[PDB]
Design a binder for this molecule. Structure first.
Ligand SMILES: *[C@@H]1O[C@H](CO)[C@@H](O[C@@H]2O[C@H](CO)[C@@H](O[C@@H]3O[C@H](CO[C@H]4O[C@H](CO)[C@@H](O)[C@H](O)[C@@H]4O)[C@@H](O)[C@H](O)[C@@H]3O)[C@H](O)[C@H]2NC(C)=O)[C@H](O)[C@H]1NC(C)=O
Ligand SMILES: *[C@@H]1O[C@H](CO)[C@@H](O[C@@H]2O[C@H](CO)[C@@H](O[C@@H]3O[C@H](CO[C@H]4O[C@H](CO)[C@@H](O)[C@H](O)[C@@H]4O)[C@@H](O)[C@H](O)[C@@H]3O)[C@H](O)[C@H]2NC(C)=O)[C@H](O)[C@H]1NC(C)=O
Ligand SMILES: *[C@@H]1O[C@H](CO)[C@@H](O[C@@H]2O[C@H](CO)[C@@H](O)[C@H](O)[C@H]2NC(C)=O)[C@H](O)[C@H]1NC(C)=O
Ligand SMILES: *[C@@H]1O[C@H](CO)[C@@H](O[C@@H]2O[C@H](CO)[C@@H](O)[C@H](O)[C@H]2NC(C)=O)[C@H](O)[C@H]1NC(C)=O
Lengths: 331, 331
């Protein structure tokens, strides 16, 4: 139990008049620490690099405590010895040199700062006082504590084999839109080198909904474009996967936040002039407008951007019928 | 007078019973010719290489004649001598060695054929028996007669200096359309190397009527083409001069004998499809057609050839409005 000396608990009275210092009894033995006691009323606070213990003794000579932990110890319990008498009790339990753990427990090191030895140059464990409970999918090496004033080196976590996967800790990352990414040395809590997960080939017919250019495609119909594109969700209530990388600027036209409402399949979209003098084809299908009032000339028309022409040529004239900011198609 | 022996005329009776032969008395003297007489009734025909004389003597011993000329003689008269008596009369006068003459008189050479010596390789005087009265603008050299049986060489025409121009004989040629051409060694009768006469520069505004592609331009308006073109007449009742050489095939379109009537300025023309799949612009202005019956859509239209488009773009659509074999322009 990482203890060596028999534990004797003084009374509340002996605790007060006597001097107390924090100690570290292991297999090697007791290590003295520079402790300063504080007692005015019914409160006794011993402050140490390792921890801060508050002694509240209002009982019939009995004493109780609580501990604020500055640094977790390894393979040695943090006890309190009475100076000049054998009364030695043990307050803090301590923890082993935990090794080979994915999602390690948060181990504090206050006395000084941690030194990391990342094999494979993982650059995963951030430096400083604390070792967070960051999920560690793949990592190898040793993390050690240190303190300049007293050279105490404590091994918190050594990984020999890389345990890549944990049940509650994938090697994947999910964005806020459930966008599936793959982490080379990271998890959901902290992910190194995320690379989107590509959708499996030949399962495009299976996919239901896609997302692209700030617009959520409904039912994956995009008649003016090659199926599929963007981030696509297979089934429902599942994450999205990367399919086809297409720019949101087909020439000098931008999808979203635009002057001109049109259609990419069923989904209603807005389109705006990126380049004023860019001559390219509209990236969406047009909206029809019935102008047959009071047969006569019946045409259908759609609003269009400057120098931008929808793909449909007028049948009657075999030519792109445009005048002003409108395109027409006669019956 | 190219004669040497005193002229004595026999009676009609002496002429008949006696033998007669043709002679050539010059400065050198008399040359005998192989003559054969013919006498049945009142007709005496002496046949010679030089000439054929018919003697008709029904008078009181008087005799008269006429002469068919086979070969003109030079510097010696052709007389008839009576064989065995001194009676020698002279029938044909003869002609000198004419030289330096533009439009020389027609000189016959029957006995043989002419040999030409064209200096400057004119190739103007055609070979053979006759020397026509071809107008000779520029020529130098000698033309001589010859006869194989009897070697008589007679100089008909020697040119020393080239007399290029005669009052009734220009060095120009006029076509049936009064198309002015210029002859290097020819006249209107016979023209060598004709080269059209170009119209003087800067007198294009002055010219009235032009001719091009089987169509006579009236008043030299050709609005779809650069003024002027073809053969143009300055003033009136004057010849035409060569201005601008333009093909009658602007792409795959032919002026004249065509399906489609149109206009090159004021003149009405016909146009036909040279190349079925040639894509070029019409070479004429279109004809308008009022289709405003029972406001409404009013358009004007002109018939056009396959893949041929008139220059006028429709104003309303800024595009070449074509459907079938018709082009339209809306008001
Ligand atoms: C949309 O894209 C356009 C094309 O990229 C942007 O403007 C054009 O940009 C190109 C190159 O980026 C320029 O090309 C240069 O042209 C000059 C000659 O320019 C001048 O002369 C021409 C002919 O008269 C005239 O059209 C121009 O307006 C200039 O007056 C060359 O010397 C260079 O080497 C190079 O080839 C274009 O000139 C430029 N202008 C035009 C009208 O295309 C445009 O700015 C973009 N729009 C936005 C909002 O960014
Ligand atoms: C009017 O002019 C036209 C163009 O001069 C005449 O027909 C065309 O003539 C050109 C050359 O004289 C040919 O060019 C050759 O093309 C072949 C390839 O030909 C084949 O493949 C193409 C593409 O599919 C297809 O369009 C053709 O019809 C052929 O099936 C090359 O291998 C040669 O090296 C050369 O480049 C054209 O192919 C030919 N045809 C067409 C449709 O343009 C036409 O005949 C003229 N009209 C009259 C009445 O004379
Ligand atoms: C990190 O890199 C090493 C290679 O540099 C990977 O494999 C190790 O290779 C060395 C040299 O042969 C062996 O001694 C180690 O035992 C190997 N590690 C094993 C087998 O786990 C190693 O797999 C890499 N780690 C990660 C997480 O990618
Ligand atoms: C024909 O060609 C000659 C040149 O080969 C032209 O000029 C003659 O030149 C020779 C050589 O100097 C002179 O001896 C002649 O007297 C020149 N002829 C003249 C002066 O008439 C000649 O002009 C040409 N003729 C034509 C009709 O073009």
């Amino acid at each position: 139990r990482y203890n060596q000396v028999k534990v004797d608990r003084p009374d509340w009275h002996t605790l007060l008049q006597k001097d107390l210092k924090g100690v570290l009894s292991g297999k090697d033995g007791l290590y003295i620490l520079r402790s300063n006691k504080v007692w005015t009323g019914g409160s006794v606070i011993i402050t140490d690099e390792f921890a801060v213990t508050t002694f509240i003794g209002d009982h019939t000579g009995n004493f109780k405590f609580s501990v604020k932990v500055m640094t977790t110890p390894i393979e040695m319990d943090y006890c309190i010895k009475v100076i000049d008498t054998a009364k030695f009790f043990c307050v803090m339990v301590g923890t082993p040199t935990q090794r080979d753990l994915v999602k390690p427990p948060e181990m504090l090191c206050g006395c000084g700062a941690l030194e990391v030895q990342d094999n494979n140059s993982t650059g995963l464990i951030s430096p400083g006082n604390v070792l967070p409970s960051k999920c560690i999918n793949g990592w190898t090496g040793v993390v050690t504590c240190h303190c300049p004033y007293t050279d105490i080196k404590m091994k918190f976590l050594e990984n020999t084999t890389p345990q890549k996967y944990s049940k509650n800790c994938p090697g994947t990352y999910l964005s806020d839109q459930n966008f599936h990414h793959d982490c080379k040395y990271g998890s959901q809590e902290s992910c190194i080198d995320p690379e989107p997960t590509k959708l499996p080939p030949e399962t495009y017919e299976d996919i239901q909904e896609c997302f692209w250019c700030s617009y959520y495609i409904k039912d994956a119909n995009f008649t003016p474009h090659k199926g599929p594109l963007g981030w696509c969700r297979v089934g429902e209530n599942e994450p999205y996967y990367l399919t086809n990388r297409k720019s949101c600027v087909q020439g000098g036209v931008q999808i979203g936040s635009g002057e001109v409402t049109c259609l990419i399949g069923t989904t209603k979209i807005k389109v705006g002039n990126f380049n004023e003098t860019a001559i390219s084809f509209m990236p969406c299908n047009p909206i029809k407008e019935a102008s047959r009032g009071p047969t006569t000339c019946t045409y259908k028309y759609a609003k269009t951007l400057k120098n931008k022409i929808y793909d449909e040529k007028d049948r009657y004239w075999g030519q792109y019928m445009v005048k002003g900011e409108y395109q027409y198609w006669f019956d």
